């Protein structure tokens, strides 16, 4: 019966998703609706800024992409994927896209501001999470991937840098730059080196099973404090990933190592999340035996910690970044390429 409820929930969620997928929102604000405050993070396409929406006084995180840089990096379709998908999804652990628009120079995605900082920052500072704390975060990713995959979406960039902690201590996934809706296999070389599945590195067709591999990398890094495969040169990271070998800290519980051997499985025909039982091989694993999946979804579980908050618009949980003045050209750049944005 629990499984049928999940089925019915995801069926209704897909009906809502497809309505927005087929009829995406467009041009729902403009730049001078916002006061720009501070850069929260940077990336190859641009930067994410803390902004204040003038008419409501709400704070948001505004992702800014330079259209010319997107084109140079061959990320046009990925960027169209990112916005089309983000404006259509709805889940507790996915950041909410509130507005989007473009101008002569840039694309803008305006998201709910998540004030607690990147999981990356807390994880590096504290060293490692306890297994209960790592389980709390991991359970949210499990449910988020069950949601995304049911919509034929593959996320493809799971890492602590992309997981934000909200004021309740829960996770918000951001950065859908590599998210893709696909029923077949796909082939694009993309992701982050430490998190790449072997079939990506080896240039095979791949599917949603790469997200479950990446979950194994995330859980490992959360509980160990370092990822299962690292080296100073990416090539050496890839050699470790495809080798089939993995070692675990001596403090890893027996259940945690068994779960990770089934997630960090090089053989697609054996990898948890890709078998006949789908995600239920993960949700029913002994390591998750105390996890109340509904309570997690409803945010009724006490969080490991609540991030510090001095006030609204406070960024103390984020690093400082060099500020650059947002310039808008007098001429429209790349209009045809981004016409649907």
């Amino acid at each position: 019966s629990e499984q049928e409820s999940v089925k019915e929930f995801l069926a209704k969620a897909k009906e809502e998703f497809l309505k927005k997928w087929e009829s995406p929102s467009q041009n729902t604000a403009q730049l001078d609706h916002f006061d720009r405050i501070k850069t929260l993070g940077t990336g190859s396409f641009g930067r994410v800024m803390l902004v204040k929406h003038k008419e409501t006084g709400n704070h948001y995180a505004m992702k800014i992409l330079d259209k010319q840089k997107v084109v140079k990096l061959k990320q046009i379709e990925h960027t169209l994927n990112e916005k089309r998908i983000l404006q259509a999804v709805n889940f507790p652990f996915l950041v909410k896209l509130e507005f989007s628009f473009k101008d002569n120079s840039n694309l803008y995605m305006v998201m709910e501001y998540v004030p607690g900082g990147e999981m990356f920052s807390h994880l590096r500072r504290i060293g490692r999470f306890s297994e209960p704390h790592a389980r709390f975060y991991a359970a949210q990713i499990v449910l988020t991937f069950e949601y995304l995959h049911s919509l034929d979406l593959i996320y493809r960039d799971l890492k602590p840098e992309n997981l934000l902690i909200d004021q309740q201590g829960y996770i918000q996934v951001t950065d859908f730059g590599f998210a893709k809706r696909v029923k077949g296999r796909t082939w694009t070389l993309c992701g982050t080196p430490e998190y790449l599945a072997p079939e990506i590195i080896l240039s095979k067709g791949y599917n949603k099973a790469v997200d479950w591999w990446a979950l194994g990398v995330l859980i490992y890094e959360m509980a160990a404090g370092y990822p299962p495969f690292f080296a100073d040169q990416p090539i050496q990271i890839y050699e470790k990933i495809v080798s089939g070998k993995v070692r675990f800290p001596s403090h890893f519980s027996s259940d945690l190592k068994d779960l990770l051997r089934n997630l960090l499985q090089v053989d697609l025909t054996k990898r948890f999340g890709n078998l006949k039982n789908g995600v239920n091989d993960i949700k029913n694993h002994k390591w998750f035996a105390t996890t109340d999946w509904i309570a997690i979804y409803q945010r009724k579980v006490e969080a490991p910690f609540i991030p510090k908050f001095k006030g609204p618009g406070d960024t103390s949980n984020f690093d400082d970044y060099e500020e650059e003045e947002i310039r808008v050209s007098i001429n429209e750049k790349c209009g045809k390429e981004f016409t649907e944005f």
């Binding site: 990320q75 694009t188 982050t192 430490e194 690292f230 990416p234 070692r247 800290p249």
Partner: peptide, 19 residues
Amino acid sequence: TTYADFIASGRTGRRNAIH
């Protein structure tokens, strides 16, 4: 220790995506 090796490595900062 593996942790000491990690902390001394070049990969403890934010990791860029590849493509």
